[PDB]
Amino acid sequence: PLKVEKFATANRGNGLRAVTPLRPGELLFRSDPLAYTVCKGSRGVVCDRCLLGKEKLMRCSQCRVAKYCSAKCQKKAWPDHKRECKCLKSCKPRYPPDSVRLLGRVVFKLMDGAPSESEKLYSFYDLESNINKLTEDRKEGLRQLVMTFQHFMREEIQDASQLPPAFDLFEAFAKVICNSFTICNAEMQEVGVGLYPSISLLNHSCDPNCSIVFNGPHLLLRAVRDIEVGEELTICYLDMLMTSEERRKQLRDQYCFECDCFRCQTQDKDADMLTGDEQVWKEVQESLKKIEELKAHWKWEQVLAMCQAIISSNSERLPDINIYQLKVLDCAMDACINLGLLEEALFYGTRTMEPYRIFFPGSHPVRGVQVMKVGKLQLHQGMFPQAMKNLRLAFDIMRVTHGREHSLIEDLILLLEECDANI
Ligand SMILES: C[S@@+](CC[C@H](N)C(=O)[O-])C[C@H]1O[C@@H](n2cnc3c(N)ncnc32)[C@H](O)[C@@H]1O
Ligand SMILES: [Zn+2]
Ligand SMILES: [Zn+2]
Ligand SMILES: [Zn+2]
């Protein structure tokens, strides 16, 4: 039986609340997506279905846009790819925005598919759209998406009759804007985008009592604090490495609300996040736009070159607790891991440890994975005691955030065995 229930909140629409007392690490819900797709940067880098990277992917012979890691994945993806195939083919070489491909998959799923388990607590139809809060600029954006969708879908959908009854394309894209989940791989690289409508019941907190993790497109919702009966369940919608100003802008632009939490009222941590010379971190913040774009396209060599010019600059440097500096170190570490530059990766990774401890309090899956990456680097270098403390710390965090149902935990147990036996 469910440990969570939908309820109507006083001032933030519908939410989820505990039906029984919950402890850290308690599995609360598991969901596949109602619909999902690979993101623009990872298209052709990860399998369309299982979202795992591979040096060589096979492509769908009809559209040559969908790509897969194996015959099995291509075959199993076919029912949900079949109708989009003709639309993807007939629009080459124009590839649609991610949201447009995602909505295509929603419409086909709702038209041809059995009722989805993802919609057990809340369906696509119930999703919040924030229509009466959208700015004129946002509305103009949505109208362009509607027309893009109508074009993309021409081959399969000619009119309302082939859409679910009373389906409003404008309102559907509005739901997508505030309800899309970014799907991350085991290394916490963004690889996909999906709708998980039951999970969409979780309201936001900059200091949450729950967490979500992805294992391919499969999502796990876990408690990360003690939660009493009737208490609202919350997740953080946002990157932890953001100032209250940055959080304000995103919660406004994407989700149409103002956060009244304690952290927003007091600018909790903002001063520490922005230490170092303002001129310097402004330029770093600007450069990070290009760096993140490159990372999103798995361009590790170019990512590294740009990060090294900042980390080892001839001019003034930032403290590692500065969030822009911190992100640069994170990107540099990941580029080094993927390029096999393990010594350099470890230098960057170890410098991130204390700032991560500060910015990801309690149990957060991003800290757990970062700590696991550092311990794994230490283990490969044969620094067994330093490795063992980090692997154990990773396990303390990830047993709460990931749990036994996540395959990455089994990988970590192997690493602890390998390190413990060597000790
Ligand atoms: C993923 S949905 C969450 C469930 C939503 N309350 C509903 O009724 O369907 C995201 C939307 O919920 C509302 N919301 C989420 N967190 C909030 C918060 N902390 N304060 C006020 N509104 C919030 C905003 O309307 C936001 O766009
Ligand atoms: Zn696959
Ligand atoms: Zn195809
Ligand atoms: Zn807040």
Swiss-Prot record:
Stored InterPro entries: H3K4_H4K5_MeTrfase, Hist-Lys_N-MeTrfase_SMYD3, SET_dom, SET_dom_sf, SMYD3_SET, TPR-like_helical_dom_sf, Znf_MYND
Gene Ontology cellular component annotations, sorted alphabetically: cytosol; nucleoplasm; nucleus
Signal peptide span: none
CDD domains named in the record: SET_SMYD3
Modified residues (Phosphothreonine): T20
Alphabetical list of Gene3D superfamilies matching this protein: 1.10.220.160, 1.25.40.970, 6.10.140.2220, SET domain, Tetratricopeptide repeat domain
Activity control: Histone methyltransferase activity strongly stimulated by HSPCA.
Catalytic activity from the UniProt record: L-lysyl(4)-[histone H3] + 3 S-adenosyl-L-methionine = N(6),N(6),N(6)-trimethyl-L-lysyl(4)-[histone H3] + 3 S-adenosyl-L-homocysteine + 3 H(+)
Annotated residues for binding of Zn(2+) 1: C47, C50, C69, C73
Biological process, per Gene Ontology: cellular response to dexamethasone stimulus; establishment of protein localization; methylation; myotube cell development; nucleosome assembly; positive regulation of transcription by RNA polymerase II
Binding-site residues, Zn(2+) 2: C60, C63, H81, C85
SUPFAM superfamilies per record: SET domain
EC number: 2.1.1.354
MF (Gene Ontology): histone H3K36 dimethyltransferase activity; histone H3K4 trimethyltransferase activity; histone H4 methyltransferase activity; RNA polymerase II cis-regulatory region sequence-specific DNA binding; RNA polymerase II complex binding; RNA polymerase II intronic transcription regulatory region sequence-specific DNA binding; zinc ion binding
Zinc finger (MYND-type) in chain: 47-85
Region (C-terminal domain): 270-423
Residues reported to bind S-adenosyl-L-methionine: R12, G13, N14, Y122, N130, N179, N203, H204, Y237, F257
First-listed, main subcellular location of the protein, grouped into a coarse class: cytoplasm
Tissue specificity comment: Expressed in skeletal muscles and testis. Overexpressed in a majority of colorectal and hepatocellular carcinomas.
Localization terms from the record: Cytoplasm; Nucleus
Chain ranges of the SET domain: 2-238
UniProtKB keywords: Acetylation, Chromatin regulator, Cytoplasm, Metal-binding, Methyltransferase, Nucleus, Phosphoprotein, S-adenosyl-L-methionine, Transferase, Zinc, Zinc-finger
Function summary: Histone methyltransferase. Specifically methylates 'Lys-4' of histone H3, inducing di- and tri-methylation, but not monomethylation. Also methylates 'Lys-5' of histone H4. Plays an important role in transcriptional activation as a member of an RNA polymerase complex. Binds DNA containing 5'-CCCTCC-3' or 5'-GAGGGG-3' sequences.
Subunit annotation: Interacts with HSPCA. Interacts with HELZ. Interacts with POLR2A; the interaction may be indirect and may be mediated by HELZ. Interacts with HSP90AA1; this interaction enhances SMYD3 histone-lysine N-methyltransferase.
Recorded family membership: Belongs to the class V-like SAM-binding methyltransferase superfamily. Histone-lysine methyltransferase family.
Protein name: Histone-lysine N-methyltransferase SMYD3
Organism: Homo sapiens
